[model samples]
Target: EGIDVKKQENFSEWYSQVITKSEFLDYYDVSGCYIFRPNCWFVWESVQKFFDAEIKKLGVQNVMFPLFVTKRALETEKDHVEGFSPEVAWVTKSGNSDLQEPIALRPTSETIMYPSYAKWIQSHRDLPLKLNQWTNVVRWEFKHAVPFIRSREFYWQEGHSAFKSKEEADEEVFTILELYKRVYEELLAVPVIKGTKTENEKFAGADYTTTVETFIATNGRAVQGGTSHHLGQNFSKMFKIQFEAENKETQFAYQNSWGLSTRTLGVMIMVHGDDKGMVLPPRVAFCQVVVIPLIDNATLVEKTKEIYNELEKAGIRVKLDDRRTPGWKYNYWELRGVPLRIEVGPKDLEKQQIMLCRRDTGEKWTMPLSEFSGDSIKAVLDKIHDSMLNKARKEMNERIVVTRTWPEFIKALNSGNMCLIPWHESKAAEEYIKEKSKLESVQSQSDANTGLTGAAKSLCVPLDQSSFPSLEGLENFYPEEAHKKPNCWALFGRSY
Candidate 1:
C-alpha cells in the first residue's frame, strides 16, 4: 500500500508508514527492536562491502568479540561506566538458577574489547592494534525509540584501534571520519556537517569526539550519522593497555574507536523519500534498475528480457518485475524506491526504445535501448545521484541559522531551524536560556539529554577557522544570555 501522510503534514507517521510499506523494516516483539527486512539488509550489505574494502586498504582487519562483558571489567573505566550504567542490561541468572557474577549486555564494545588489547600488545611491533567488528549492540532505552534511529539492538561496524602515540591516533580518527562521510554523502546521498563535539559533549573517556550530523527535513531535527573518537590514554590506562616502545620503555597506548551504523538508512529515507515513498541513491540501492512489462505482447516480454540482460551485463542491479499487473508493478518499485524504472510495451518495441523514469525526481523520458547497451546506464545513475545530493545540500544549508541574540535564537530555533550561537563557558547555561524561553527541561551537556531549553539546544561547535560561520540567515545578529562578544558558534537544535 502507498503511504498516505504527506511529508510536511506529519513526518513521524510518514516515516513509520514509508519504512514498513516499502518493506524496509518490520517490528520485533521487543518494543525497541525492528527487523531489517531483506531489502534493507541488501543496503546494509552494500555499506559493509564498500566500507570493508576501504578500511582494509589502510591495513585495518576484521575481528569479532563476545557479546557480554564482565561487570568488573565494565566498571573499570569509571567515567565510561558512569555515562553508561543507566542503560546497561545485565544477565545475572542461568536458565534455572542464579549465576555467581552478573554479566552486562554491551551497550558499547569498548569495555569488552580493550582488555584483550592490553594482553595482546607486548612490544612496539604490537603498537597499532586495529580491528573492526560488524555486529549488533544492545542498549536498553524505551523512550522515543523510533525504528533504526533509536533501536535497542542496532547493527553497526565498530572499529577499535590502539596506536603508539596521539599523532598516529589523530591520523586514524580523521581517516575513519572521512570514510564515514563517504558512507553518508557519497553512498546514501545525504549531506552532513563535520563538527567537533565540545569538551562537555565529547564521548565519555574520549579526548575529543568528531561526528557527522545530518538533518531530517520532515521533522527539522539533527541525527548523528556516525562518530569517531580519539581516546588519549583514558581507556588504555584504565584497562592497562601498556605496550613496550623501541627503547624498551613502557607507555600507555593512544586509542581511538569509530562507528557508523544502520541509522544511515533512516537518514537516507528521511532526506530523499517524498510523499510517494523512499528515493534511494543509486550508489547503494540494491536494485538500481527495475524493469516493468507494460503490455501483454509476447514481443514486449521478449524485448524486455533482452534489454534486462544488457543492463545486467553492464553490472547494474536490475530487477524484472513481470509477476504482477503493469499498474501494480509500477507502484511496487516506487514503494521500494527503485532508482530507475524501465517500461517496455508492444508500441515501444516497434520504436526500438523504452521509457526510463528516475525515482529521485520522477522524471520520465524515452531512451534508445541501444544507449543503455553500453556505459550509459551508469551515466544516468550518476546524474541522479548528483541531482539529489545538490538538492539536499541546498536544503541543509537553508536550515542552518546563525543567531547573535537570545530573541533571534529562540525565534530561529523554535521555527524549526538550527541556531548557531556565540556560546559561553557554557557550563550550566541552560537555566538562563530556559527562563527566557519558558521551559524547564534538563539540558544535557554530555550530548545524551535533550538539552532542555526547548525543542532546540546546543548541537556542536565548528571545527576550524578563526571566525565567519558562512551561515546567512542570522546576518542581522542577535544575542542570548551573553555579557560579551562570543568567541565561537555552537550549533543549537532539536535532535532526533
Candidate 2:
C-alpha cells in the first residue's frame, strides 16, 4: 500500500513514519540518535559530494580534526562556553581513575580545532587556512528527540578557515553562504532566504552569522537549514592564532566557520514529503527513477531486460523491480519518492514503449523505450525537477503573508502563515516574541535589501509608523502594502 502523503492531518506522526518506513533511518537504542540507513546515507553522500566540489573550487580543503576537546580549550571563548555549556556532555573520569581535567565531546569543532590552528599558522604562507571536516557532534537536549530535526547527535561538515585580511574572510563568508543557497535551491529543491542573525541569534562568539532559512511542509514554519559565520578575529584573539604577514608584522588572522548537517535531510523530508511518503526532488533523491518490468508472458522478460540495460547505460540512477507485482512495486517506489517511474509491461514490449509517471504531480505519459537512452532521459529528469521546484516555490510564496502590526503578526502566525512585518525595536523584542509565542525569527533584511545592512529600523512592526517617524523617509524602505499608512514592516512567524 502507498504511504500517506496527506500533510494536513497528523503532520508529526506522518513525518516520523515516512522517515522510518522509507528505510532512511533506523531507531537506535539511545534516545535522540538514529542509525543512518542506506537511503538516508546515500542522500547525505550526494550532499557531501556536491559541497566538497564547491568548497574545493573555493580553495577550501577537507580535513579531519579530533573529536574531543579539553575543558580548557572548550572554555576558551566566553560566549561559546555559555552558549553550549548547558547542553555539553562531559567525560569526568578516565579508564580507571578521575582525570586531571574533564573533557567535553564537541558540540562544535571551533574550540577544539582553533587551538591547533594557532600552532600551525605561523607565517603569511599559512594565512588562508581553509579546512572542512565531516564528523558527528553531540548536544544534550531535554526535549523530545525527533530523528533529524532535534537529535542529540548528528553528522555534519563544519568548515573552518583563517585569512590574513578581514576583506578576504568576509568574501569567504558570503561565498559559502551563496554555496549553501545553491544547495538548498538546486539540490534539495527547497527555496530559501539568506540573511544575518541578530545578536541574540548569532552563533556564539561569532562576529556575525549568516543563515539559509526555509519553511517546512508540515507547517509553514521556518527552519535554519545551514549557517555560515564570519567569525572575524574572535577565535584568533582567543586562541592566539597569529601569523606574521607579508609586511613582517604579527597579526591575528580573521576567521570564518560554516556548516550544514544531516538535519538537512530532515528538512527535505518534512518539506517535500507527502502522505504517500517522501517526495524527493530529482536532483538529490537517492533513486532518480525506478524501472519495473511487468511480465505476463515469458517472452517479455528478455525484452524488458534490454530496456533496463539501455537505461542503466544512459547514466540514469535507475532501479529495476521485476519480482513484485506492479501494483505493489508502485506503492513501494512511491513511498520512497523516486522522481520518475517507468513501467515496462507485456504490451509495452510489443509497442516498444514504456509508461512514465512523475512522482511529484502524478502526471503520466507514454514514451518510446529508445527515449530512455542518451540525452533524452536527462531532459525528462530536468522537467521533473523544474516541475517540483515551481510547485514548491508557489506553496512557499502563499505561506508568506505580508504584515506590519502586532495583531497581524499574531494573526498570520496563528493562521500558519509566515508573516513579514516591519520591526523597529531592540533585540530584546525579537527575543520576547520567540519566548512568548514559541515562533522562530527566521531572518531579517535591513529596510534596504543591501548586503549586511546593520541593525533593523524596527524589531517586529512597521518601520514607517508615525510613532517611529525617525525610521520614515529612510532610503529603500518598502513596508508591506497592507500597512502602508502606519508603523509596519517586519517578518514574524512560528517555524518548524
Candidate 3:
C-alpha cells in the first residue's frame, strides 16, 4: 500500500506520491500550498539548527520583520519591486472594510528590511550589520507548484547584511555560499555545483547572484538549491542606507543578501529516493535508527527497552517499534526512510547479537550487542552518508554534456541532457540567446514538437573554478571566446 509508483518509470507521479505517501507533507485547500507535517517540519528544524550555528559564527543575528508591506514601501526599489510584485499577495480588506493602503505579503524581505538597515546605521562603527530571519513567505505564483519545489507559501531563511567595502562584501558572499555547499554535502548527503547566475537570471537589482545548484538524473535538469547575492550598493542607494566614515565622509554601504528554502527538501527527496520510498540521510533524518523487535516470547520486551535506551542515551535518535509485527514494522520503517533498522528476536538475544540493516543499500550485518557502542553506530551512519553522496555525485556528472557550438548546444538540449556550453564573451550575445530561449519556450508549449524550443535554457555559470569539468577543448566555434574561460562555462538544462 506504500509507494506504489516506481520512481524511475513515472517521475512526476512518483514525486507526488513520495511527498504525500511518505507522510512528510499534504495538499492543502489552498491551491499552491501544502501542510508541513511533523515529519517534514523536523527535517526543516534540523537544517535550521545546523545553518543557524554556522552563520552565527560569522556574527549574524536573528531578527523578525512584519509580514505586511505598504505599496509605497515596496515600490521604493524599482527593479526589486518589478521582479516580485506580480506574485505579491495583497491584504485588501479587514472583515469587509476597505483598507486605506493595500498591504502586500513579502515575496522576499529586501524592501521590508532594508529601511530598518538605513535607520540602524549612522557611523562606520555600525558597518557589517548582519541580520537573519527564519520565516514564511507568500508568493502568488503562476507556475505549477510542486510540494516543496515551487509553492505559494514556503518556510525559508533570508539574511541581509551591510558591509564597508566591495572586498569585504564580496568575501562574505562566497563564505555564505560555501556554508550552503557544506550543509548540503555534510547533512543532506546531496552534492551540488557552486555557480553564479547570469545577468538575466540573477535576483533583481543585485550586482550578481551566486548559487549552489543540484541536479536529479531522473529528470535530466538542475535545481537552484540556494543562493547568495552581492547587492553592490544598489539597495543601499534606494533605501538611503548611509553611514559616516572615520574621516567624517558619508558612504552608502555595500550590501549582501542570501537565502535557502524548503525547495531543498524536494531536491534531496528526488535525488536519494528509490522504488521503496524516500531515503533519508542519517545526519538530517528525524529518526536516525528504528529498532524492530521480533518477540516470540513477550519477555523480550525489556531487552528491547534496554537497547533503545542505550542508543538514545548515546545521542542517537532511536525508536523501538514493538506495537506491530516484525514484518509489518520492517516495511513501515522502510517507507519512512529510516537509515538503520535493528531486529532483536529471542534467538538473537540468546546469541548476544542483533541483525542490523542499512537502508541506503540493503546490506545487513550481524552486530554484537556487547560491541554496540556510540562510536560503532556513528561510524556506520557516517559511512552511509558518504556512500549516498558518492553515488549522487556520479549520477550528476553523467548528465552534463559538454558543448562548444550553438548547434551542439541545441542538440544537447533536444537529447534531454544538461549541457555545459562555453559561450561567446559578450553580454550582448548572452542576452540574445536568452530572448530567443523565451521565444523557443513559447513555441514548445503550442506545437506538436514539444521536445524542441527556441534556444536551450542557461542554468548557471559554473563556479567550480579551474578543476572538475575542463575548458580544454572549445577550439571549434570561437577558440578565443570559449577556451581559457574555466569559470565562464554555463550549464544549460530543461528544468522543472
lDDT of 1 at 210: 94
In candidate 2, what are the lDDT values of residues 1-496, reduced to their tens digit?
A: 4455456765666776788888888888998888998878888899999999998988888888877888888878998999999889988897799988888888999998887899999998987899999999999976567778878998999999999999999999889988988888888887776666656777988988888877764455677789889998998999999998988999999999999998888888877887789888887878887878775477677766776677678877878787757888898989888988988777776787889898888888999866656477768888877777777788887887765455566666666677665444346556555554543223222211212111222222222234323335432222233233323345555543
Q: TM-score for each prediction?
A: 0.92, 0.88, 0.92
Task: Single out the weakest 10-residue window by summed lDDT for candidate 1.
Answer: 443-452
Q: Using alpha carbons, what is the TM-score of model 3?
A: 0.92
What lDDT does each candidate get? 0.82, 0.76, 0.83
Candidate 3 segments whose C-alpha is farther than 4 A from its true place: 296-299, 425-455, 468-487
Cα lDDT tens digits, model 1, 1-496, are 8989888766667888899999999878987889888889988999999999999998899998999999998899989999989889999999999989989998889999988899999887987789999999998884657777788888999999999988999999989988998988889999888788876678999998999889976556788889999999999999999988867899999999999988888888989999988888998887999988885477777788987898898899998887868877888899989999988877776788888899988889998766766378889999999999999999888988867776777777666677777665354563344355445232233223322234554567766534545433432222443354455677777777
User: Clash totals for all models, in order?
Assistant: 8, 30, 1
Query: What's the CA error at residue 277 for candidate 2, in Å?
Result: 0.7
At residue 323, give the lDDT of candidate 2.
Answer: 79
State the local distance difference test value for candidate 1. 0.82
